[PDB]
Amino acid sequence: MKPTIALIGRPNVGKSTLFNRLTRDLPGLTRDRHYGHGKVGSKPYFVIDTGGFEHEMAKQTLQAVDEADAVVFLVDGRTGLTPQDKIIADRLRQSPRPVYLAVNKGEGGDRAVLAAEFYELALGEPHVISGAHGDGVYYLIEEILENFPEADAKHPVFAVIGRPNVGKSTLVNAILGEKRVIAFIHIDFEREGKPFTIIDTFSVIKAMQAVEAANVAVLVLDAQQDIADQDATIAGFALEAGRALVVAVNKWDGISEERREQVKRDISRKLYFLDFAKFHFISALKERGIDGLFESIQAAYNAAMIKMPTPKITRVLQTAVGRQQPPRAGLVRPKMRYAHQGGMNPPVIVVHGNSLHAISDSYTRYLTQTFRKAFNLQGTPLRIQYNV
Amino acid sequence: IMKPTIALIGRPNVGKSTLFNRLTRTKDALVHDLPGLTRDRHYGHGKVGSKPYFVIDTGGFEMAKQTLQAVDEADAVVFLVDGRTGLTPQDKIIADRLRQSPRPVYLAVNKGEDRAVLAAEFYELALGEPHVISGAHGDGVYYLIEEILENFPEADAKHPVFAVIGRPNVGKSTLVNAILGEKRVIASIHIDFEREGKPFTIIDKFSVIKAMQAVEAANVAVLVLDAQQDIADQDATIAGFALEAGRALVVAVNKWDGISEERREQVKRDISRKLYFLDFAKFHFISALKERGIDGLFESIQAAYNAAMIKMPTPKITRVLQTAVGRQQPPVRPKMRYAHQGGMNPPVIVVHGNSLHAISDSYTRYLTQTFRKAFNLQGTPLRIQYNV
Numbered sequence: 164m165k166p167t168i169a170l171i172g173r174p175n176v177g178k179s180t181l182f183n184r185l186t187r188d189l190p191g192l193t194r195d196r197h198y199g200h201g202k203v204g205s206k207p208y209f210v211i212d213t214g215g216f217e218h219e220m221a222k223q224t225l226q227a228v229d230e231a232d233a234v235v236f237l238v239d240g241r242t243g244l245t246p247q248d249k250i251i252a253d254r255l256r257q258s259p260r261p262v263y264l265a266v267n268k269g270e271g272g273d274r275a276v277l278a279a280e281f282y283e284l285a286l287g288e289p290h291v292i293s294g295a296h297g298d299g300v301y302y303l304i305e306e307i308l309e310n311f312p313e314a315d316a317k318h319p320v321f322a323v324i325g326r327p328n329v330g331k332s333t334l335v336n337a338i339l340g341e342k343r344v345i346a347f348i349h350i351d352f353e354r355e356g357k358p359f360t361i362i363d364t365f366s367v368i369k370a371m372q373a374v375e376a377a378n379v380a381v382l383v384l385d386a387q388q389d390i391a392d393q394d395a396t397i398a399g400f401a402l403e404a405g406r407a408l409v410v411a412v413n414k415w416d417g418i419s420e421e422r423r424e425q426v427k428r429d430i431s432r433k434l435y436f437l438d439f440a441k442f443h444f445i446s447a448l449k450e451r452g453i454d455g456l457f458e459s460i461q462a463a464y465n466a467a468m469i470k471m472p473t474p475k476i477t478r479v480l481q482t483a484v485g486r487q488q489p490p491r492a493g494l495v496r497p498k499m500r501y502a503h504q505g506g507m508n509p510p511v512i513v514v515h516g517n518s519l520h521a522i523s524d525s526y527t528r529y530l531t532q533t534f535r536k537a538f539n540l541q542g543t544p545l546r547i548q549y550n551v
Numbered sequence: 552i553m554k555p556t557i558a559l560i561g562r563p564n565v566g567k568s569t570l571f572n573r574l575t576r577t578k579d580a581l582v583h584d585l586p587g588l589t590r591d592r593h594y595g596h597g598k599v600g601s602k603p604y605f606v607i608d609t610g611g612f613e614m615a616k617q618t619l620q621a622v623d624e625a626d627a628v629v630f631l632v633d634g635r636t637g638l639t640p641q642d643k644i645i646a647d648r649l650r651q652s653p654r655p656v657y658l659a660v661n662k663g664e665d666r667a668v669l670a671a672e673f674y675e676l677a678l679g680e681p682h683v684i685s686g687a688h689g690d691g692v693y694y695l696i697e698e699i700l701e702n703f704p705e706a707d708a709k710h711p712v713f714a715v716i717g718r719p720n721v722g723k724s725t726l727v728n729a730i731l732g733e734k735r736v737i738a739s740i741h742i743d744f745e746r747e748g749k750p751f752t753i754i755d756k757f758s759v760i761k762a763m764q765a766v767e768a769a770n771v772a773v774l775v776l777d778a779q780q781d782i783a784d785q786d787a788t789i790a791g792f793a794l795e796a797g798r799a800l801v802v803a804v805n806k807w808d809g810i811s812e813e814r815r816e817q818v819k820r821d822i823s824r825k826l827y828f829l830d831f832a833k834f835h836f837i838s839a840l841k842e843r844g845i846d847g848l849f850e851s852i853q854a855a856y857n858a859a860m861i862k863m864p865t866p867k868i869t870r871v872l873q874t875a876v877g878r879q880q881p882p883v884r885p886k887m888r889y890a891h892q893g894g895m896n897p898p899v900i901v902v903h904g905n906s907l908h909a910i911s912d913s914y915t916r917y918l919t920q921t922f923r924k925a926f927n928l929q930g931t932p933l934r935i936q937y938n939v
């Protein structure tokens with residue numbers, strides 16, 4: 164498992180600003196993220212901005228301290244020292260895990276004088292940084308990662324994920340039965356002869372790690388409630404991980420028929436960014452729909468692991484381009500000539516040609532759907548990329 | 552009578568969006584937003600203060616062409632600087648351009664939660680009195696706003712007064728000439744005309760401030776979209792402003808002459824998916840250039856105005872409500888007994904009962920549609936509200 168860094172600090176000290184630096188959809192909207200994959204640094208890691216949970220600290224914030232591999236305590240170096248900061252430092256100092264004191268917004272400053280007050284916190288060396296502009300952030304992260312040192316399974320290895328109370332335990336018990344669940348990290352089992360592995364592990368950190376360890380994620384939704392922010396950030400994390408995905412709309416036994424289309428329409432409207440995944444309507448309690456859930460889990464694994472021959476891809480591309488030409492880039496007419504796979508799990512298709520530098524999102528969506536149909540890629544977040 | 556516009560100006564990271572959110576904060580928070588997403592706003596209606604006004608956070612442009620325009624066209628500028636940091640060379644160049652302004656320019660020394668020391672450093676900018684504030688916590692903000700507004704001193708038209716709004720280059724000028732030159736149309740900021748006996752007024756490069764002023768002067772807005780491009784962020788924020796104004800709306804999907812038949816459904820799909828929050832308005836698919844489809848615009852403008860101005864008797868509303876609830880009960884089981892109109896242009900329906908504190912967004916959607924069908928309210932952003 165790769166490390167998780169939890170950002171902690173007073174409101175307005177620069178946490179989300181830092182988080183966006185470390186981890187850097189429809190028009191007019193911006194997707195809320197308070198946890199994601201660290202992209203700044205030589206090693207992979209997860210980042211949690213505990214500002215997204217919230218004076219004393221918050222229940223989930225203290226949990227993040229217990230569960231993260233390290234905490235960054237962010238403070239406003241321009242201000243001076245607020246008494247709220249001294250309280251937080253008192254709890255963090257007890258951490259048996261790393262606590263890095265980051266003195267933020269110290270850009271163009273004197274890094275020694277700006278960390279003068281903060282030795283009193285007894286959390287060690289203050290790290291003068293600037294989350295906005297990046298001064299010292301890369302070097303801070305590299306020291307955090309100097310602690311932790313840095314092949315696809317032949318069958319689907321899946322994690323059941325989702326909000327509390329959607330039915331994950333009921334689904335797992337329905338899948339495994341009593342006898343194989345009493346032998347619980349990885350539980351290998353067989354179904355109709357074919358092999359599967361389920362991963363057993365609210366804890367954001369625990370959910371990210373389930374996603375990291377799996378090659379398929381089964382996202383469980385409670386059909387009896389509206390889709391929630393937390394439903395959406397979990398699914399969003401899975402999407403950023405490129406994890407193959409199957410969606411289990413659970414507690415379907417509760418919905419009357421009149422309400423059924425209203426709920427299917429509601430769910431596709433609010434989880435549009437999952438239209439690459441098959442949606443099953445199941446009842447973990449009454450054990451209905453589980454068989455087709457397994458068909459889709461296997462299909463998601465297959466799609467995720469596909470190896471597509473360049474001539475097939477190029478053939479599919481040229482037929483699509485012949486039927487509908489790409490949008491004219493103002494005056495210039497893009498030419499799409501060939502394409503090949505540049506990644507796996509998820510598959511990535513790289514399109515080659517001239518003037519591919521401003522291809523509209525809708526045309527990229529048309530190529531994606533064509534490729535998905537041609538290669539049966541439902542279940543994996545296939546991505547198109549233009550060689551520019 | 553035009554309302555004043557205040558433009559926030561300043562370096563990245565001085566507190567503009569924070570201030571803008573404070574100044575435009577709606578207690579009820581009425582935006583039809585999705586789970587996990589947040590709708591971006593950098594201009595809106597001012598809510599802090601005794602008088603009405605608009606606010607623009609010029610940070611949403613990234614000096615810059617549009618920012619310089621806001622300096623020219625706003626009634627006043629707030630120049631936001633970081634009092635904690637000190638005085639950056641970038642701040643001084645901005646002061647050099649702002650100092651030439653023939654309109655009010657207020658120097659706000661932010662993040663002060665030391666007022667005397669922070670006013671001496673900033674007198675070097677020669678922008679007058681520094682105002683020490685804290686946009687995050689609110690220190691001094693209210694007094695700043697009242698001092699800006701102490702300059703500007705503080706009936707529905709019987710027929711539709713409509714404004715054509717939308718992004719640069721979508722066809723607004725072509726559409727206006729087409730409307731005034733149509734077959735059945737007979738002909739200092741308002742242009743009065745008539746069609747088939749009924750009266751109309753249309754309101755007469757691109758300016759965010761001018762778009763906001765068009766909406767406030769109107770009782771109906773015609774939003775023009777360029778069908779030949781993907782819906783853009785700027786398409787959505789213009790529509791979003793119209794929505795926050797509660798402005799009755801007709802949507803003109805323009806340049807339909809360019810779209811081939813195959814591409815046409817892929818485009819209607821794309822538009823309804825990305826402008827979901829406009830599902831209350833009729834969409835027309837027109838060609839302003841070839842002057843096709845303009846005739847049907849006039850009925851929808853009339854229909855939207857009529858809907859916006861409706862007066863619904865309490866017994867009819869309660870009747871429709873009790874019937875809707877009888878056919879589909881709410882999902883402890885809330886009881887909805889009666890309802891009345893508590894607002895106009897847009898109409899607002901207030902529902903009274905027990906256990907109404909957690910009604911799902913999806914049920915409120917069922918009631919909104921039910922009321923919309925029953926009272927012919929397409930074109931006005933009708934909203935349901937619960938008394939707790």
Ligand SMILES: Nc1nc2c(ncn2[C@@H]2O[C@H](COP(=O)(O)OP(=O)(O)O)[C@@H](O)[C@H]2O)c(=O)[nH]1
Pocket residue numbers: 326327328329330331332333334413414415416417445446447448449
């Ligand atoms: N009607 C219905 N209720 C269910 C179903 N699955 C779970 N529940 C109920 O949801 C509650 C929580 O289920 P649980 O498996 O613990 O959810 P978890 O938090 O995701 O593990 C329990 O009281 C279940 O009986 C289902 O398929 N249908």
Ligand SMILES: Nc1nc2c(ncn2[C@@H]2O[C@H](COP(=O)(O)OP(=O)(O)O)[C@@H](O)[C@H]2O)c(=O)[nH]1
Pocket residue numbers: 172173174175176177178179180181214267268269292293294295296563564565566567568569636
């Ligand atoms: N000067 C400076 N300003 C910053 C920095 N990071 C964030 N800000 C500004 O701080 C304001 C709010 O900070 P935010 O990131 O939301 O703090 P959070 O509440 O901890 O997430 C924004 O207007 C930011 O642009 C920094 O490193 N330097």
Ligand SMILES: Nc1nc2c(ncn2[C@@H]2O[C@H](COP(=O)(O)OP(=O)(O)O)[C@@H](O)[C@H]2O)c(=O)[nH]1
Pocket residue numbers: 717718719720721722723724725726805806807808809837838839840841
């Ligand atoms: N093909 C096509 N082009 C149009 C149409 N309406 C406007 N245009 C073109 O769009 C460009 C800008 O139009 P204009 O009315 O100035 O857009 P505005 O910025 O919204 O006022 C011009 O070159 C027009 O010829 C239409 O219905 N079809």
Ligand SMILES: [Cl-]
Pocket residue numbers: 374375404
């Ligand atoms: Cl991962």
Ligand SMILES: [Cl-]
Pocket residue numbers: 470471472475538
């Ligand atoms: Cl293949």
Ligand SMILES: [Cl-]
Pocket residue numbers: 573599689692693
């Ligand atoms: Cl205030």
